[PDB]
Design a protein around this ligand. Structure first.
Ligand code: FMV
Length: 254
């Protein structure tokens, strides 16, 4: 069972992606106070009527997601080969993967300590009850939490985490892509980097079938993407919803 060494080029790709992530993911969440403030209405009963009437957490979470899409755009532009694509394909890939990369990158704030995304003091701790206060339902939130825990338990090296985000973005099978072959060539270069990295740098037993497990998470993300889109559609029917979102969020999901 051969373990070819990482090529000079593969090493450079990993370094570039690590740098890209460090430049676009602030692990202190220090910008979050700039978003519209979180508001948490009394909703212990999980009332859909109340949740939709108030959408109390939506301005804050929409601002968080919008900010994150901006960061993902920056990250993607640094992926080796991404700028070789036409502008049209770049935008198709970004719009189709945005929610999935947000879900992946959020794993860094997610904690199994209490099953929350913890981004600072209580104000910026986001729980399932906060997501329902933004107008989403359990059919999305429950599998989202299951996804976060499963990803956590893979114990990815940062190298593997950034590669997975890059592979997710540069996917040839997104609707509307023009040069699928070029996209696939870029993705293959990243996939080969990841497979090679796992085999020579990830110790047992966590390395066992790890690449397959990571590829399965990409399939899981497609499912969550579809469910999020259905739910966003419903949310959009609420009068005055657009003011609680952002122009970027409206474009990506509308
Ligand atoms: C973003 C990041 C973070 C959390 C992501 C969350 C927590 C709150 C609920 C969110 C935002 C989920 C929620 C279902 C969601 C995603 C998009 C939307 C809207 C409200 C736009 O429909 O709601 C998806 C990702 C979840 C914090 C930090 O890790 C940065 C990361 O980019």
């Amino acid at each position: 069972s051969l373990r070819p060494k990482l090529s000079e080029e593969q090493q450079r790709i990993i370094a570039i992606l690590l740098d890209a992530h460090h430049k676009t993911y602030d692990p202190t969440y220090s910008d979050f106070c700039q978003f519209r403030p979180p508001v948490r209405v009394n909703d212990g009963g999980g009332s859909v009527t109340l949740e939709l009437s108030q959408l109390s957490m939506l301005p804050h979470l929409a601002d968080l997601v919008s900010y994150s899409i901006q960061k993902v755009i920056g990250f993607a532009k640094m992926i080796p080969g991404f700028r070789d694509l036409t502008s049209e394909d770049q935008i198709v890939l970004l719009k189709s993967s945005a929610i999935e990369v947000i879900m992946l990158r959020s794993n860094e704030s997610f904690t199994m300590d209490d099953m929350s995304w913890t981004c600072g003091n209580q104000d910026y701790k986001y729980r399932v009850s906060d997501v329902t206060k933004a107008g989403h339902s359990l059919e999305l939130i429950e599998p989202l939490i299951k996804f976060q825990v499963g990803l956590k338990k893979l114990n990815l090296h940062e190298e593997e985490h950034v590669l997975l985000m890059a592979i997710c973005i540069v996917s040839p099978d997104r609707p509307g892509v023009q040069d699928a072959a070029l996209i696939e060539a870029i993705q293959d270069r990243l996939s080969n980097t990841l497979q090679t990295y796992i085999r020579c740098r990830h110790p047992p037993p966590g390395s066992h079938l790890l690449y397959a497990k990571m590829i399965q998470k990409l399939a899981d993300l497609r499912s969550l993407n579809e469910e999020h889109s259905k739910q966003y559609r419903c949310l959009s029917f609420q009068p005055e919803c657009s003011m609680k979102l952002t122009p970027l969020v409206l474009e990506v999901f509308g």
